Design a protein around this ligand. Sequence first.
Ligand SMILES: CC(C)=CCC/C(C)=C\CC/C(C)=C/CC/C(C)=C/COP(=O)(O)OP(=O)(O)O
Ligand SMILES: Nc1ncnc2c1ncn2[C@@H]1O[C@H](COP(=O)(O)O)[C@@H](O)[C@H]1O
Ligand SMILES: Nc1ncnc2c1ncn2[C@@H]1O[C@H](COP(=O)(O)O)[C@@H](O)[C@H]1O
Ligand SMILES: Nc1ncnc2c1ncn2[C@@H]1O[C@H](COP(=O)(O)O)[C@@H](O)[C@H]1O
Ligand SMILES: Nc1ncnc2c1ncn2[C@@H]1O[C@H](COP(=O)(O)O)[C@@H](O)[C@H]1O
Ligand SMILES: O=P(O)(O)OC[C@H]1O[C@](O)(COP(=O)(O)O)[C@@H](O)[C@@H]1O
Ligand SMILES: O=P(O)(O)OC[C@H]1O[C@](O)(COP(=O)(O)O)[C@@H](O)[C@@H]1O
Ligand SMILES: O=P(O)(O)OC[C@H]1O[C@](O)(COP(=O)(O)O)[C@@H](O)[C@@H]1O
Ligand SMILES: O=P(O)(O)OC[C@H]1O[C@](O)(COP(=O)(O)O)[C@@H](O)[C@@H]1O
Ligand SMILES: [Mg+2]
Ligand SMILES: [Mg+2]
Ligand SMILES: [Mg+2]
Ligand SMILES: [Mg+2]
Ligand SMILES: [Mg+2]
Ligand SMILES: [Mg+2]
Ligand SMILES: [Mg+2]
Ligand SMILES: [Mg+2]
Lengths: 319, 322, 319, 318
Amino acid sequence: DVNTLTRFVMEEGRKARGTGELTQLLNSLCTAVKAISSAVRKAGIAHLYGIAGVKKLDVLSNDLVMNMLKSSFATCVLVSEEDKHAIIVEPEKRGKYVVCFDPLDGSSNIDCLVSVGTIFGIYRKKSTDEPSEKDALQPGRNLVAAGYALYGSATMLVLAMDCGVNCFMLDPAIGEFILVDKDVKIKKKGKIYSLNEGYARDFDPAVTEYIQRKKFPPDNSAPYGARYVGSMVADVHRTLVYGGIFLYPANKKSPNGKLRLLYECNPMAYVMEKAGGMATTGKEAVLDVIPTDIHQRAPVILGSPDDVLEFLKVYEKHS
Amino acid sequence: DVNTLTRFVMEEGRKARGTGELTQLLNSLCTAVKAISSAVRKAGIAHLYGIAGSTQVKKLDVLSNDLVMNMLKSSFATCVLVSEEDKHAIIVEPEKRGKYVVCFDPLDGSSNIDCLVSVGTIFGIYRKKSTDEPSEKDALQPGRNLVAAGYALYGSATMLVLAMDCGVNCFMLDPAIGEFILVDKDVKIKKKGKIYSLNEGYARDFDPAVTEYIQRKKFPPDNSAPYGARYVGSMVADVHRTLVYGGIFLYPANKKSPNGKLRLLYECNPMAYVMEKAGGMATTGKEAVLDVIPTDIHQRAPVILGSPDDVLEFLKVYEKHS
Amino acid sequence: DVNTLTRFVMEEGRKARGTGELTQLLNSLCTAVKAISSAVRKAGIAHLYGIAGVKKLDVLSNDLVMNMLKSSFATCVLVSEEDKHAIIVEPEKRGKYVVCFDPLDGSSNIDCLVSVGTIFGIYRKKSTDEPSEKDALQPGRNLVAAGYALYGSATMLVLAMDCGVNCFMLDPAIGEFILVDKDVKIKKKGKIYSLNEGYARDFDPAVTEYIQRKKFPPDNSAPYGARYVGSMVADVHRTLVYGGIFLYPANKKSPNGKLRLLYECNPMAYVMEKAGGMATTGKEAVLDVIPTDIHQRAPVILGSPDDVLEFLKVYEKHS
Amino acid sequence: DVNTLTRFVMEEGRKARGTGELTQLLNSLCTAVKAISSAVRKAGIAHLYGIAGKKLDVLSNDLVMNMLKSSFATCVLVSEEDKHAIIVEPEKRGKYVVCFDPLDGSSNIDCLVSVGTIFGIYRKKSTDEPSEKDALQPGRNLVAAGYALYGSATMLVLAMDCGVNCFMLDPAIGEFILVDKDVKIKKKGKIYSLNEGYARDFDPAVTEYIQRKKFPPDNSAPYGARYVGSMVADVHRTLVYGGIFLYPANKKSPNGKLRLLYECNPMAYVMEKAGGMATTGKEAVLDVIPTDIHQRAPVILGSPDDVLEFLKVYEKHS
Ligand SMILES: CC(C)=CCC/C(C)=C\CC/C(C)=C/CC/C(C)=C/COP(=O)(O)OP(=O)(O)O
Ligand SMILES: Nc1ncnc2c1ncn2[C@@H]1O[C@H](COP(=O)(O)O)[C@@H](O)[C@H]1O
Ligand SMILES: Nc1ncnc2c1ncn2[C@@H]1O[C@H](COP(=O)(O)O)[C@@H](O)[C@H]1O
Ligand SMILES: Nc1ncnc2c1ncn2[C@@H]1O[C@H](COP(=O)(O)O)[C@@H](O)[C@H]1O
Ligand SMILES: Nc1ncnc2c1ncn2[C@@H]1O[C@H](COP(=O)(O)O)[C@@H](O)[C@H]1O
Ligand SMILES: O=P(O)(O)OC[C@H]1O[C@](O)(COP(=O)(O)O)[C@@H](O)[C@@H]1O
Ligand SMILES: O=P(O)(O)OC[C@H]1O[C@](O)(COP(=O)(O)O)[C@@H](O)[C@@H]1O
Ligand SMILES: O=P(O)(O)OC[C@H]1O[C@](O)(COP(=O)(O)O)[C@@H](O)[C@@H]1O
Ligand SMILES: O=P(O)(O)OC[C@H]1O[C@](O)(COP(=O)(O)O)[C@@H](O)[C@@H]1O
Ligand SMILES: [Mg+2]
Ligand SMILES: [Mg+2]
Ligand SMILES: [Mg+2]
Ligand SMILES: [Mg+2]
Ligand SMILES: [Mg+2]
Ligand SMILES: [Mg+2]
Ligand SMILES: [Mg+2]
Ligand SMILES: [Mg+2]
């Protein structure tokens, strides 16, 4: 029996006895993602090059997500990688939910046509006060839903909630997200490690030792393969589907890591944990970090539970 | 003025005073690339999952091979076809026989298909040189003999990169109209880049020259900035980023693979031809990739390619290790 | 604020305090219409002609609507123009609603590439009896929702409910129906008449007289223009947009006309009346006919109220 | 073997030993038609209605105009949208003159009726500097003509010396696929097509002929009536199903309504190449010598037997 993102989301809303507000948020997000996919894939580019005789993808993607979420009547605070401060929804359009998102992840990769994506995390506003940027400062444990859209060789939306992780393929012929992977679980242990080894000179000693174990296995297993696409959504999605480990640890140009807690690390950590994986900063679970800045960065090590636990053991040995 | 791949190829054929046979070959290739691209982006996947009930099923690698084979045969422009999917070269039937020999990888990056990472198609076009009946040996030409080569990349967007004597030109596929649009003319690679690309998981089996060269990128002895690392895992994606951003891409020989992994005829040679036409380099370490005279249509070759300064720097380290 | 069919349908369900079953039905119907539209526009026809080295459009369209409605868990009885008997949904997937539909209207225009469409009408099951065809034998007055999809120069879905008639344009780039005309109302009087004048030799006398007045007005008024696409959806949609009158009347050889009450006349009559128009069989309003057979025919005269009332005046003259 | 419009046009050019100029013209026109089809079908309409926070007539004209100019194959372009002929700048001039309606039937586009692009291609006849008069050639001189129908599906019908060929646009890949080769119209049809709202204005020959279709004096079956209201849609049905299409003169349109250069002549050329007929009542449409680029003509076209039967009735009334 075929299922779609629209029907699946609506059915889960009916099960939870929701008022329909979260369902409208997800429907609006789904529409914005389809519009981003069309633009990322350069539909209409012929008009830019004069077939009949202007917006950067970063701005258009932000505008698409911002406008659809505002018009959903489901949100009150919107945090985006593109905006210095949180956007406060006007009272007439205001709902209960706080959405933190990266409208287009993979900035180094647009010009070379490597996979990009959108990352999102949805929180519930806990106060009766007027909404503010402070409402976005919540640990990932408070996430109601999270996931990402990957604009790779095909477009797929991965949605994680209490019920688990579910993957939907965009059928561009009919503009419909089709459920293709139900209740997905990551492999217990993988065979691929993913990180930028160009920072080897500045690596944490724990990072250096862990990578050495991947290349020279102490138990005489086969060495891991290496893959680093350079876009977090692509590297994380491969980790979900194939298993393994993804790392963006602290380096010296990024003593707290590079990736952003609220809208990059927390959503990916939430997807991993709902899929039976792990996601750590080295000191604690990513989802347990209590942020003080909506744009604060965090080191992230996520993936198959046996691979993350192995890195943690190396990290503990180095204190 | 706006320019399309169809218009561009036709005009180049007019300039060269061709009979139109190569123009028809390229037209058929472009149509096949559009069809592969549509399937890669999963058009009609809803029917596979039962939107209409239990009433295509072919895997993308099979369908891509079928598309390129059928379109090239129907172009009336080819006589010998070499594919990664077939052990022996396909000899085109006499009724549909043209002058050209095409070696192609219909869908490069197989390990990345299920994780939705960029994949692509690679092709190299040769002119038949002998007067014998067409056979496999007509595909055993060095890359120097290439008439045209390039690739289609099915990434965040779909781009056809076409390299010929006139240089390298990039076309963006506009899916709204099914038209490849010329977006970068006569592209030239950077003299030197800041990205290195290889599978470092094989470090234990690295050739000593590779070990030293990679060490130079992570720990530059001259106090310059260490290079960034990128390894998508699909040759088309990694090569295209090298073309666009500069840098170096390596799939070298190792202790277990004396001839590397990538195939000379339809992976290394077309990429080498694109790199050289763009002002880059492509070597096996011992010689230029384009100068290797193959004896087997599926023989492997080590490949190091990218910005000329970076490739030369590797060759310096390679010669130090002899 | 931009509005989509998905968001509009969901919000109307929230206002109605529905359980979400009708919303799921409409979502499923929306997906099927997009799938039909993609097939009608011949997506993938290159593979049928051997680009890589069978099912009629009516059958595929019927399969799409049948499967999407069944999997919605919202229907119990399905009456299609393409099926001899009413289809009874398997007990595990049964919902409260009865759907009568023509999956592809205008079959004679398929091969000449003239506009075609899909017509649907939605009823609530009125009894707790075991579902059967009698649950579809309801007067059009009992309709909960009705409308049509038009696959013309563009694809549009027209949805009629208690709130009125709303028109949504399908954006193929993203597979989204965009609300473009809200709460639409037909003109009081039009200037176009629509019927197959090739049947003039067998015309009912009222039809002969009425059409004669349209072409040779006794006033000093201009004669009406003539349009007859040959697909009911296209001719009716033009009547809604421009005003005027559409007729497929009875004659001596066809005392009940040709068009079918359940899935052609009732849905179009419902749209017309919600738009401020009329639709009559001559003897009574189309929506007041109580059917006894699921494929029973009915004469239909519909359009602007002044034009329909003028025809009924001529109809009364000939008894 | 699968065949595309691009391959078909190129192979025909190779057969004709052309220099490739007309092939570039047809390739450019094919690209514009795909762009019009995407726009007609409302791709990206969500952005017009504010998803992120040019009228079809003008945009269709710009697509055809720009693609034809950049083809380097044209010198004079006549469009229904432009009052005067467009003269290509000398640097981009080719030998061909193109007369087209970029979007026919758009006068009723608000009801989503089928629309289309109609085109006729001429070789420049005179050696004078290019001007409007270069488009005043009879339809007899057409090198190529046809139309793109944006109906339930998009199809390009291309008529040349070799005959009439029909290509379906596969929107999944943006490729025109040859689906009907060397098509011929039925000798006699069963459908008549015209706006009977002008019945009060019809000349006695038209009135008698239509009466014969509804009341056949020989007890045969009456013809069916179809009138989409868009010339491309009605003519294509006539080509594919057989029958007759009529837009005769009336009080509002004493010289007819449809345009000779870019509506009647291309459709007349397609019909004759398909074994059909197209007449004004007095002469073949293709033999009329235009004096004004936007001049109108009455037209009766379709299956040869149906047009011949009309012409007997016309002769009966002188
Ligand atoms: C919208 C549907 C289902 C069909 C008909 C109704 C309309 C309104 C317009 C269709 C005209 C058309 C231009 C169809 C092409 C649709 C299409 C193939 C959309 C997706 O574009 P892709 O070429 O698939 O983009 P990607 O392959 O890069 O995802
Ligand atoms: N579509 C849905 N899928 C999963 N959970 C939902 C959905 N809708 C609502 N919920 C749950 O119900 C809560 C309240 O719903 P709402 O009234 O829509 O805010 C949410 O915070 C979720 O915990
Ligand atoms: N479209 C084209 N672009 C570039 N070079 C071409 C083209 N067509 C033909 N040529 C050149 O002309 C030669 C003969 O053309 P052909 O007659 O098509 O075999 C080719 O091998 C190329 O060197
Ligand atoms: N999306 C909707 N739009 C309009 N009316 C609705 C909607 N959902 C429910 N209703 C109304 O509420 C009734 C019961 O809804 P349900 O519980 O979904 O069967 C329907 O029969 C309609 O009258
Ligand atoms: N693709 C083609 N299809 C049919 N006829 C063509 C084609 N190309 C050229 N011709 C014929 O050759 C003539 C001269 O071609 P050209 O040199 O392209 O102007 C044209 O006017 C046509 O009669
Ligand atoms: O070049 P680096 O340092 O390895 O950065 C890679 C990471 O940076 C990012 O590009 C940051 O996201 P943005 O591109 O949206 O700024 C991640 O997607 C990616 O994982
Ligand atoms: O996993 P590895 O050893 O790094 O191999 C990666 C290379 O193998 C390939 O996948 C070989 O191409 P195919 O997938 O067509 O066999 C290249 O695309 C890629 O550069
Ligand atoms: O050719 P006729 O007798 O005028 O019939 C036209 C009518 O028949 C129909 O085609 C019946 O619908 P179907 O094509 O689905 O059978 C209507 O769409 C149309 O209004
Ligand atoms: O409304 P009428 O008088 O029947 O005219 C119909 C004719 O007018 C036209 O719409 C004129 O063409 P345009 O719509 O492009 O101006 C023809 O397509 C059609 O055959
Ligand atoms: Mg970003
Ligand atoms: Mg990011
Ligand atoms: Mg390969
Ligand atoms: Mg391969
Ligand atoms: Mg039907
Ligand atoms: Mg019908
Ligand atoms: Mg017009
Ligand atoms: Mg016109």
